[PDB]
Amino acid sequence: KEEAIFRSAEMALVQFYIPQEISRDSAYTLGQLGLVQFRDLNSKVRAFQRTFVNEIRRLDNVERQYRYFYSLLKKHDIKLYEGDTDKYLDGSGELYVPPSGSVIDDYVRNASYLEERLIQMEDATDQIEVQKNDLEQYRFILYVTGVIARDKVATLEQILWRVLRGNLFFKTVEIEQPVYDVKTREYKHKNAFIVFSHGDLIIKRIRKIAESLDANLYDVDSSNEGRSQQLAKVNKNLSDLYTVLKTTSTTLESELYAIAKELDSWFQDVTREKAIFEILNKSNYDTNRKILIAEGWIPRDELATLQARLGEMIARLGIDVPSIIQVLDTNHTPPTFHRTNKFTAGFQSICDCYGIAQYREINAGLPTIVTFPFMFAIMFGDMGHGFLMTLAALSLVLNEKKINKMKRGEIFDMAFTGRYIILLMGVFSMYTGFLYNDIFSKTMTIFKSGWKWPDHWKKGESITATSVGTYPIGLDWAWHGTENALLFSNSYKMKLSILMGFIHMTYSYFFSLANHLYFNSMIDIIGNFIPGLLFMQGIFGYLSVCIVYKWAVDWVKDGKPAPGLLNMLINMFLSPGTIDDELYPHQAKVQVFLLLMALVCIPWLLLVKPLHGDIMIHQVIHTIEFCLNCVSHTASYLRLWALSLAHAQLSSVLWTMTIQIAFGFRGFVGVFMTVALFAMWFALTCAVLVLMEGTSAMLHSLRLHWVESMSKFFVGEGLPYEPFAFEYKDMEVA
Amino acid sequence: PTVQSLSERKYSDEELRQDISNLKEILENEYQELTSFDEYVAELDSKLLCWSPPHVDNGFWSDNIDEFKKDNYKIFRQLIELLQAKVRNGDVNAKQEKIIIQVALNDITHVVELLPESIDVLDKTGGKADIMELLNHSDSRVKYEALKATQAIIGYTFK
Amino acid sequence: SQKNGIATLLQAEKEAHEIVSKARKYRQDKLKQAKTDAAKEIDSYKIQKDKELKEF
């Protein structure tokens, strides 16, 4: 049936005994199955003396050869010819178990043969290119004779005339076309260096000076017939070199194109056998007996599937020797396994970056998928910015298949990882903007206002409003653009944030309840849950319920003044019964009663758990940490309010100083003014707001889940579960 | 190569390992006996050249190349004559003829690098033109050897 | 059981190793017996040759 994951599933430690002959095939099929984590067996044996070292270094050499081939591919005009298909074939290996085969030796031999042949071909091509460059200079035709860059010919002439104070003939001519310089590796201009002078020593000095200026010289025949014969011989040699160069280039290009058609497949495969041999050395192999034997961690609810797959492999192979496996129930802590769909993978990863949920308790990864986006939206509520961010997410979701086969890069790396979080994030932003009725800090008018202005408002005079109705969803749009609006919004958020944060605390602490109840934990529940729950309720839940009742009762209509919220909170701690105006009858009795209850929670939280105490030192620090931490988180819940105001008035000022100036005088120049100002406003609204403060509120709503939620029930770190599997990583680069 | 790969493979049985070692030693002795310049000369005397000598004698065994240098590149002239006869026969499309031509081209390329003087003999006998024509042959396996030989002749001797 | 199965596998591996060692010892004993039989055959050939010479 189903094997979904709240926090984990019961997983088993299984030991493997396998025959030597089918050991590699079993490792390959297990790797393409990828479900078991092998614990440490021969970690004492260091790397330089492992069992499979020689094939490890052989595979390293062939990997280097493949990297050399890919270097040639990128140097030429081809890249990943099979990347479209080979990547899919490796990805299609899931639930397919492709055969591996003993063609690894053939792969190694063919790779070495291709490597040496390509090395020889590359050496031939570079040498023949050097010859071609040399002959082009030698092809020049009109004592000493040579060619040199046309930039330095004047300097050469001047220095020659200076160092040789005597006279000499100079008949330099610029080359018709630039020639690729060997040293400069650039197609710079060139010029002839024909010169004639008497004196053997003078000629030798001139030759040395010319060679000192990176000038190449040739034995140009003075006689017309000899020069013509030399030119004809050079032309014939150049034609032969052109022919052989074309043949070599065609052969090299064909070889590289053939290699690129399957290089990705061999690279992915050889990486898979690299992992296979790494796991092989990780085993407890011993050549004195049945060679391979090892142990591993498997989920219990797929041991039957694993055994069936192994039996299918054994049927595929010719060996009839059984290789069954059995569970070994040790006392060690099992790893932590979390199945997750694409809609939850990023959520769970971000949630457990704090720590690893050790076992079959209740984790925090599941509630995150909903609490995270809604906390961010509470801190971010706006139809405009939320709509932009949701369109970004949606455009990152529909083209998922396009993005799965490409690298996002340092602009969208975290975005690619958080590809689905921001979608539900933007949906909750839709909600919060529906409630926080501002759109780019401007309020919508879809619903009729419940508050009516006076029929005759004086221009410039203060104007009051009478509550002649109520607004169905969100704040009444009459609040927009009023002095008292901000205060009303501060009070409302205060209370909204405090209620949401308290309810999040209660939800996490009930997760702690479920965690404790899953195990026996009879001492743990009585020692920690009930006293802490009673304290937390009696203070903060009482605050919440009296807030709700304060909202429920029509204080203006009832005649009774609305008591100060924080005073009704704290005069409990100062002097019970000191009530300016009770919320409900018998209020002071409730105050003293549950205040005494909260006070006696502390000895309850301190005494009952350490009973047999040796763990009293841990218990007392846990108790004080819990109480101060509860009050700290309850206070921290006010920065949802803080971010809400930051976003609201930041959008307000941005709109007021961009769009409220865009219209200007509404002239012909006003059109350009509003175009430029809306361009600036959009650039800011995106880059500043939805990136900077969008990420800020995202990360702060994430701070919620780091500390306030998980510190209540995340007991500690557990062993991560990473089964031996291939992933087709590093298609081209690593 | 199969025995080399088997020796590389980690056979579990000690008896199998000893047998593999003995077979490898026998194969190495046979290869060393195949590295005889006299054997290469005898093979070149007849047709259907084998591929085991020409990887050492026209190569690491520079003594064979030095001997082939004698009598004014007598062995090189004989090989060039054999190649010219094979080309002129018109049966290059034959698989056996293709293998013989490939072996001859490999030997000629090995000899040319060692003895640059043989380039003049090849040019006088038309070996250069024959090699250039063979560079366009459809036999890709023979084409690679022909291109290597042309690069060796043009790259070193023609320079 | 799992531990019992591991012990049985170890015992089977030890038995296989002992069988291989016994086969090697049998091969060595066969070589020694071949040497002894060669000595006996040499003695028999010497006796037969002496008998043939005496008969001649």
mmCIF file of N, CA and C in Angstrom, chain B residues 2 4 10 13 17-19 34 43 55 61-62 78 85 87 93 101-103 110 113 118 128 132 147 151-152:
data_model
loop_
_atom_site.group_PDB
_atom_site.id
_atom_site.type_symbol
_atom_site.label_atom_id
_atom_site.label_comp_id
_atom_site.label_asym_id
_atom_site.label_seq_id
_atom_site.Cartn_x
_atom_site.Cartn_y
_atom_site.Cartn_z
ATOM 1 N N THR B 2 43.509 -9.643 -24.383
ATOM 2 C CA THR B 2 42.547 -10.352 -23.548
ATOM 3 C C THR B 2 43.217 -10.923 -22.306
ATOM 4 N N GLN B 4 45.976 -9.783 -20.962
ATOM 5 C CA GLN B 4 46.336 -8.643 -20.125
ATOM 6 C C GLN B 4 45.148 -8.176 -19.295
ATOM 7 N N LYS B 10 40.589 -9.203 -11.041
ATOM 8 C CA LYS B 10 40.952 -9.841 -9.776
ATOM 9 C C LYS B 10 40.178 -11.149 -9.635
ATOM 10 N N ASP B 13 40.084 -17.252 -7.435
ATOM 11 C CA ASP B 13 40.799 -18.508 -7.248
ATOM 12 C C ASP B 13 42.301 -18.305 -7.400
ATOM 13 N N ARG B 17 44.524 -17.602 -10.737
ATOM 14 C CA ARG B 17 45.527 -16.546 -10.830
ATOM 15 C C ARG B 17 46.862 -17.093 -11.322
ATOM 16 N N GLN B 18 47.274 -18.255 -10.808
ATOM 17 C CA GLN B 18 48.523 -18.860 -11.260
ATOM 18 C C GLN B 18 48.452 -19.236 -12.734
ATOM 19 N N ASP B 19 47.317 -19.789 -13.167
ATOM 20 C CA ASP B 19 47.150 -20.131 -14.576
ATOM 21 C C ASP B 19 47.189 -18.885 -15.450
ATOM 22 N N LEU B 34 58.196 -13.047 -31.471
ATOM 23 C CA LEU B 34 57.646 -12.399 -32.651
ATOM 24 C C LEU B 34 58.344 -11.086 -32.977
ATOM 25 N N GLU B 43 58.227 -12.434 -43.196
ATOM 26 C CA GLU B 43 56.842 -12.060 -43.455
ATOM 27 C C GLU B 43 56.743 -11.101 -44.633
ATOM 28 N N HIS B 55 54.614 -3.884 -34.716
ATOM 29 C CA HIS B 55 54.471 -3.016 -33.557
ATOM 30 C C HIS B 55 55.755 -2.902 -32.746
ATOM 31 N N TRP B 61 61.861 -1.735 -31.534
ATOM 32 C CA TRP B 61 63.051 -2.486 -31.937
ATOM 33 C C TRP B 61 63.747 -1.744 -33.080
ATOM 34 N N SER B 62 64.473 -0.688 -32.703
ATOM 35 C CA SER B 62 65.158 0.141 -33.689
ATOM 36 C C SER B 62 66.249 -0.620 -34.431
ATOM 37 N N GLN B 78 61.533 -2.649 -51.046
ATOM 38 C CA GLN B 78 60.683 -3.823 -51.216
ATOM 39 C C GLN B 78 59.259 -3.544 -50.751
ATOM 40 N N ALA B 85 52.478 -2.426 -56.169
ATOM 41 C CA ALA B 85 51.833 -3.544 -56.847
ATOM 42 C C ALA B 85 50.405 -3.732 -56.357
ATOM 43 N N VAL B 87 48.429 -1.418 -55.101
ATOM 44 C CA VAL B 87 47.627 -0.312 -55.612
ATOM 45 C C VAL B 87 47.319 -0.515 -57.091
ATOM 46 N N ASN B 93 39.712 -2.962 -52.818
ATOM 47 C CA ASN B 93 38.434 -3.140 -52.141
ATOM 48 C C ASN B 93 38.371 -4.434 -51.339
ATOM 49 N N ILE B 101 47.323 -3.701 -47.226
ATOM 50 C CA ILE B 101 47.680 -2.321 -47.531
ATOM 51 C C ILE B 101 47.850 -1.519 -46.250
ATOM 52 N N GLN B 102 46.971 -1.740 -45.269
ATOM 53 C CA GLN B 102 47.090 -1.028 -44.001
ATOM 54 C C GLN B 102 48.387 -1.385 -43.289
ATOM 55 N N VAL B 103 48.738 -2.672 -43.269
ATOM 56 C CA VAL B 103 49.985 -3.088 -42.630
ATOM 57 C C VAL B 103 51.180 -2.480 -43.351
ATOM 58 N N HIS B 110 56.314 3.957 -40.257
ATOM 59 C CA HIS B 110 57.311 3.736 -39.216
ATOM 60 C C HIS B 110 58.723 3.901 -39.761
ATOM 61 N N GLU B 113 59.753 7.781 -40.580
ATOM 62 C CA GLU B 113 60.139 8.584 -39.425
ATOM 63 C C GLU B 113 61.566 8.276 -38.991
ATOM 64 N N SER B 118 64.513 7.792 -46.996
ATOM 65 C CA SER B 118 63.564 6.998 -47.767
ATOM 66 C C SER B 118 62.506 7.847 -48.458
ATOM 67 N N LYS B 128 55.055 8.625 -52.927
ATOM 68 C CA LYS B 128 54.346 9.786 -52.400
ATOM 69 C C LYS B 128 53.007 9.978 -53.102
ATOM 70 N N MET B 132 49.313 9.688 -51.438
ATOM 71 C CA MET B 132 48.350 10.777 -51.560
ATOM 72 C C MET B 132 47.036 10.285 -52.152
ATOM 73 N N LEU B 147 46.696 8.634 -43.824
ATOM 74 C CA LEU B 147 46.831 10.008 -43.358
ATOM 75 C C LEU B 147 48.009 10.153 -42.407
ATOM 76 N N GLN B 151 51.185 12.537 -43.130
ATOM 77 C CA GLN B 151 51.606 13.542 -42.161
ATOM 78 C C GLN B 151 53.064 13.345 -41.766
ATOM 79 N N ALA B 152 53.481 12.092 -41.578
ATOM 80 C CA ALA B 152 54.875 11.826 -41.242
ATOM 81 C C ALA B 152 55.808 12.251 -42.369
#
